[PDB]
Amino acid sequence: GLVKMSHPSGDVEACMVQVTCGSMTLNGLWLDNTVWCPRHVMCPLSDPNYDALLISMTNHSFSVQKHLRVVGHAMQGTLLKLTVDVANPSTPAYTFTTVKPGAAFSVLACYNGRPTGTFTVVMRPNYTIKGSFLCGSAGSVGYTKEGSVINFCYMHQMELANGTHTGSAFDGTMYGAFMDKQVHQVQLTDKYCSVNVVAWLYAAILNGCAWFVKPNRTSVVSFNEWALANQFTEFVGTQSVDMLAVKTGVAIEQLLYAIQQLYTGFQGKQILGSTMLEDEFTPEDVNMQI
Amino acid sequence: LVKMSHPSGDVEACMVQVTCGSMTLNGLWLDNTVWCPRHVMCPADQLSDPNYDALLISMTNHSFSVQKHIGAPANLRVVGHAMQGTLLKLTVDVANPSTPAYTFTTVKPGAAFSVLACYNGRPTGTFTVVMRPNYTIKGSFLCGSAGSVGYTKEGSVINFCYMHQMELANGTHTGSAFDGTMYGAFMDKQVHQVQLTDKYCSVNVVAWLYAAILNGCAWFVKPNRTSVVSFNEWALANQFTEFVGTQSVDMLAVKTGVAIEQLLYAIQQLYTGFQGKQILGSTMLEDEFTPEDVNMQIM
Numbered sequence: 202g203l204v205k206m207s208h209p210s211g212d213v214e215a216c217m218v219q220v221t222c223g224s225m226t227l228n229g230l231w232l233d234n235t236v237w238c239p240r241h242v243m244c245p246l247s248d249p250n251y252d253a254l255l256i257s258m259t260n261h262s263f264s265v266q267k268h269l270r271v272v273g274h275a276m277q278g279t280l281l282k283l284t285v286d287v288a289n290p291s292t293p294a295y296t297f298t299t300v301k302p303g304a305a306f307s308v309l310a311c312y313n314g315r316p317t318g319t320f321t322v323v324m325r326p327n328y329t330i331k332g333s334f335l336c337g338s339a340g341s342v343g344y345t346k347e348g349s350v351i352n353f354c355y356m357h358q359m360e361l362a363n364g365t366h367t368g369s370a371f372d373g374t375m376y377g378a379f380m381d382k383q384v385h386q387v388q389l390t391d392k393y394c395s396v397n398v399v400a401w402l403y404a405a406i407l408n409g410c411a412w413f414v415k416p417n418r419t420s421v422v423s424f425n426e427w428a429l430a431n432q433f434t435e436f437v438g439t440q441s442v443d444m445l446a447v448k449t450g451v452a453i454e455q456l457l458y459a460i461q462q463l464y465t466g467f468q469g470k471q472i473l474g475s476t477m478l479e480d481e482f483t484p485e486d487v488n489m490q491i
Numbered sequence: 492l493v494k495m496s497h498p499s500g501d502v503e504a505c506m507v508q509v510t511c512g513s514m515t516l517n518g519l520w521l522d523n524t525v526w527c528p529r530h531v532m533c534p535a536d537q538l539s540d541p542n543y544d545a546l547l548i549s550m551t552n553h554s555f556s557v558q559k560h561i562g563a564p565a566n567l568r569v570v571g572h573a574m575q576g577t578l579l580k581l582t583v584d585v586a587n588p589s590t591p592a593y594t595f596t597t598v599k600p601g602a603a604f605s606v607l608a609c610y611n612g613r614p615t616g617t618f619t620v621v622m623r624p625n626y627t628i629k630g631s632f633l634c635g636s637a638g639s640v641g642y643t644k645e646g647s648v649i650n651f652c653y654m655h656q657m658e659l660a661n662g663t664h665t666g667s668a669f670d671g672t673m674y675g676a677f678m679d680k681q682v683h684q685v686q687l688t689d690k691y692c693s694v695n696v697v698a699w700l701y702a703a704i705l706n707g708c709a710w711f712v713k714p715n716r717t718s719v720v721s722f723n724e725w726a727l728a729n730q731f732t733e734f735v736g737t738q739s740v741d742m743l744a745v746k747t748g749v750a751i752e753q754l755l756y757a758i759q760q761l762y763t764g765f766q767g768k769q770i771l772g773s774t775m776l777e778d779e780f781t782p783e784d785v786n787m788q789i790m
């Protein structure tokens with residue numbers, strides 16, 4: 202069976218700081234001479250004018266604590282870019298790439314600048330995540346690692362009226378275009394991550410559970426038109442999926458056909474003990490864990 | 492309801508690679524001591540029947556090489572060696588300057604801890620497991636993970652509770668407590684060993700049903716009740732642990748208004764299968780969430 206696995210968090214722990222502006226406080230991320238944090242900390246809340254708020258900021262509007270003097274301030278989308286006079290001596294090698302729905306990443310949950318827990322989520326097709334966050338977590342950070350390069354991909358912003366969560370990429374854009382204000386907002390309807398359901402079926406086949414494999418095939422292009430009408434994402438193949446097809450001898454298109462049948466029901470059978478489709482493990486997860 | 496682990500940085504700073512002859516695995520560097528599994532002493536002949544007492548006598552301080560790869564790299568010299576149960580206690584001539592405040596305590600079945608999986612002294616992943624009623628854990632471990640460390644954290648104090656030793660069957664593992672005793676009394680040698688049958692951790696199943704009620708999923712709740720004593724007689728016959736209430740569980744009962752005995756009755760109906768229904772996105776009973784975990788996460 203598959204195990205939820207997160208990256209070691211030490212590297213990122215060393216970058217977490219607390220940012221306070223007026224009576225607001227949250228978490229920031231300190232890289233080199235810059236502290237990133239959500240611009241909501243500038244707000245005195247239901248409909249802020251962040252452009253005016255930025256103008257009103259003065260030399261000592263922000264205070265940064267590591268559990269740091271601010272020399273400049275800028276805004277990049279829904280994030281603030283705060284210049285500090287001391288460079289983080291433990292800045293990892295990093296990139297800022299936006300994650301796509303179905304991709305997994307690790308989250309370091311923090312409160313007032315202190316790391317408290319870590320877990321892994323997949324970005325949902327409706328650009329929310331199913332995290333575990335309490336009040337005081339605004340500015341917590343999500344990331345993947347490739348080699349020793351950290352890709353920072355998520356800065357936490359808000360809990361929606363569901364239990365679901367959203368935030369920003371470090372280019373400043375909010376995932377799913379949610380507005381960083383306290384107004385009722387409703388997410389789009391979620392979908393199954395097709396490529397992840399495919400990975401899970403491959404995991405089943407690797408563990409001896411393969412009754413759903415038939416010779417029938419459904420092409421990618423044909424599955425994708427069906428998916429638009431049945432709350433699945435578009436399937437996009439990857440070399441990681443190809444590796445699963447090679448070591449099982451079962452082609453993607455056989456599994457696309459199987460999903461079409463399984464969406465109707467499992468007949469009277471189980472898959473890896475479950476009678477529901479699973480889309481929270483990626484092809485990369487299955488490759489490295491089986 | 493996410494699988495939550497402690498931030499791993501405190502423990503990452505203590506992981507080292509330990510080598511002896513042709514064997515290499517992970518060690519834990521705390522002050523002037525490096526802890527690692529004693530299997531690192533075992534030669535290729537005798538991997539199935541080692542004489543660790545004799546192996547230890549044949550060893551010198553010079554038999555052991557120790558490196559720290561991540562963070563500030565490694566100048567460690569072994570100046571002493573001892574064996575404690577299934578663990579080696581190596582003494583080095585530099586005290587780890589990032590040693591956390593720590594304790595050694597053995598965990599009991601049903602309790603959860605974080606694991607930092609490492610390979611050749613390099614941390615690669617973290618996850619949370621529960622100590623199973625048959626004294627195994629179901630982690631994600633590959634070859635080269637022997638000596639990876641499990642732990643909890645309370646305030647500033649890390650409790651180290653697990654040093655990974657062996658894969659018993661696919662996906663089933665065991666290890667030592669830091670007093671050196673193997674969980675489940677498994678033997679640290681290359682031989683097939685059968686484990687006792689696993690059981691559902693009843694108090695964690697109860698915590699999870701409370702989490703479902705808190706989240707608006709309560710179709711399984713009936714007025715009907717089963718007493719603790721009568722449930723525990725049933726559990727003996729159905730591979731469930733004995734239910735033992737705690738203050739953490741009582742908090743959930745007060746908040747939801749649903750008595751423990753109502754959920755004990757519901758478990759008896761739900762192990763007969765969910766019919767076609769789901770609970771918190773699952774079609775089977777879940778027992779890896781503790782009452783403390785549910786109280787923490789759902790407040």
Ligand SMILES: Cn1cnc(Cn2c(=O)nc(Nc3cc4cn(C)nc4cc3Cl)n(Cc3cc(F)c(F)cc3F)c2=O)n1
Binds near residue numbers: 241335
């Ligand atoms: C339950 N929950 C789960 N995730 C979250 C995230 N979250 C948060 O941690 N804080 C928020 N509001 C603040 C209140 C403050 C009080 N002080 C003294 N300082 C504060 C700082 C913040 Cl950020 N919010 C709400 C929220 C945050 C935003 F970034 C935003 F644009 C709009 C919002 F309505 C929040 O969701 N809470």
Ligand SMILES: Cn1cnc(Cn2c(=O)nc(Nc3cc4cn(C)nc4cc3Cl)n(Cc3cc(F)c(F)cc3F)c2=O)n1
Binds near residue numbers: 634637656678
């Ligand atoms: C798939 N898997 C999941 N968990 C494990 C744990 N595990 C392990 O990582 N290594 C082991 N044997 C070694 C071989 C070595 C080869 N070199 C060069 N160095 C080695 C070091 C070790 Cl420890 N084992 C097997 C094993 C380990 C013990 F500690 C023991 F007492 C008996 C055993 F059969 C292992 O289970 N692998």
